[PDB]
Each structure stands twice: as C-alpha cells, then as structure tokens.
Amino acid sequence: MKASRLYTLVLVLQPQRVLLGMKKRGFGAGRWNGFGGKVQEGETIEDGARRELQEESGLTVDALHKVGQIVFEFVGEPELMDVHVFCTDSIQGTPVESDEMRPCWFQLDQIPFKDMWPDASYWFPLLLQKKKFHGYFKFQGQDTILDYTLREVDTV
Ligand SMILES: Nc1[nH]c(=O)nc2c1ncn2[C@H]1C[C@H](O)[C@@H](COP(=O)(O)OP(=O)(O)OP(=O)(O)O)O1
Ligand code: NA
Numbered sequence: 001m002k003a004s005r006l007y008t009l010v011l012v013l014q015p016q017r018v019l020l021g022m023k024k025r026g027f028g029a030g031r032w033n034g035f036g037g038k039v040q041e042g043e044t045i046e047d048g049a050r051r052e053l054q055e056e057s058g059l060t061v062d063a064l065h066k067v068g069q070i071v072f073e074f075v076g077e078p079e080l081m082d083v084h085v086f087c088t089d090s091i092q093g094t095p096v097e098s099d100e101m102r103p104c105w106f107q108l109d110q111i112p113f114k115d116m117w118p119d120a121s122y123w124f125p126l127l128l129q130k131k132k133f134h135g136y137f138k139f140q141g142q143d144t145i146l147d148y149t150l151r152e153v154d155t156v
C-alpha cells in the first residue's frame with residue numbers, strides 16, 4: 001500500500017465561463033488547470049483550497065463547495081496525490097498573474113482540453129454538469145494514462 005499527500009484544486013466556474021491558470025515556470029509549464037497546491041498542517045482541506053486560490057490567482061472567496069476527489073499515481077513515484085476538487089460559489093475581485101500561474105477565462109464551449117491534464121477530459125465534463133465524482137488515474141509521465149477509474153457519487 002502507498003502513502004498519499006493532500007492537494008487541492010479549485011475551479012472558478014461561472015454560468016458561461018471558467019477561470020483556469022497556465023503554469024509558467026519549471027517542469028510542467030504549459031498546462032492549464034484550476035488553482036491549488038499542497039494542504040498544510042492544521043488547516044482544513046477547504047481552507048487550504050481557499051488559501052491556494054488566493055496565492056495563485058489573487059482571488060479571495062468566503063466559501064467553496066466540494067465537487068470531487070481524484071487520486072493520481074505516477075509510474076516511479078511511490079507517493080499518491082490525493083486531490084480534493086472544489087468550485088467557487090461567488091467571486092469578488094479580479095484574477096492576477098502570479099509567478100506560478102497566468103489566469104485566463106475560457107468560455108464553456110472553448111474548454112482548452114488539449115492543453116490541460118489528460119484526466120480533465122474525463123472528470124471536467126462531470127464538473128460542468130454539476131455532478132460530484134471520485135476518480136483515480138495512473139500516469140506514465142505527464143501525457144499517458146495507463147489505468148483510470150471514474151465514478152459519479154452522491155457524496156464526495
Ligand atoms: N493530473 C492532474 N490533473 C489535475 O486536474 N490536476 C492535477 C494533476 N496533477 C496535479 N494536479 C494539481 C493538483 C494541485 O492543484 C497542483 C499540484 O500542486 P503543487 O505541487 O504545485 O502544490 P504546492 O504549490 O503547494 O507545492 P510546492 O511546490 O511544494 O509549494 O496540480
Ligand atoms: Na503551497
């Protein structure tokens with residue numbers, strides 16, 4: 001059995017558009033995603049998600065709603081990534097480029113799947129339908145899924 005590390009992912013989903021951020025530097029630059037990062041000691045997962053959204057995009061929100069959980073396994077990495085996925089309930093400011101992320105709005109008929117993580121093609125449609133989900137994806141490298149499971153759930 002493997003150990004897991006907690007991460008968050010936040011999607012600012014509005015009726016006609018979604019905010020994504022492009023990772024700018026280091027390895028993995030060039031992919032659009034929601035905003036998030038590692039949960040820290042003592043904070044709830046939801047509070048860590050709010051913190052990462054603020055650090056990465058400049059947006060503050062009072063509340064999130066949990067929509068899914070996705071476990072990622074990478075060949076050659078013994079530690080699993082346990083990603084808790086949230087959507088914002090309202091936003092109150094403008095996104096700001098940081099050094100980790102360049103935020104950009106996308107219309108919901110222009111979701112940039114080819115420039116997102118491959119797994120997003122599977123679970124993000126559920127997110128768009130306002131469904132809740134559990135997923136697992138095993139990757140070889142950054143691009144190749146070797147195994148995955150995805151299930152709609154009534155409770156995350
Ligand atoms: N396959 C995948 N699909 C997806 O949709 N999001 C993924 C993903 N793999 C990783 N992520 C997300 C989870 C999280 O939001 C982010 C990874 O977090 P990071 O390691 O950048 O966190 P931190 O910035 O806290 O870490 P440090 O560099 O240690 O500060 O990418
Ligand atoms: Na962090």
Ligand code: NA
Nearest residue numbers: 036037038100
């Ligand atoms: Na990061």
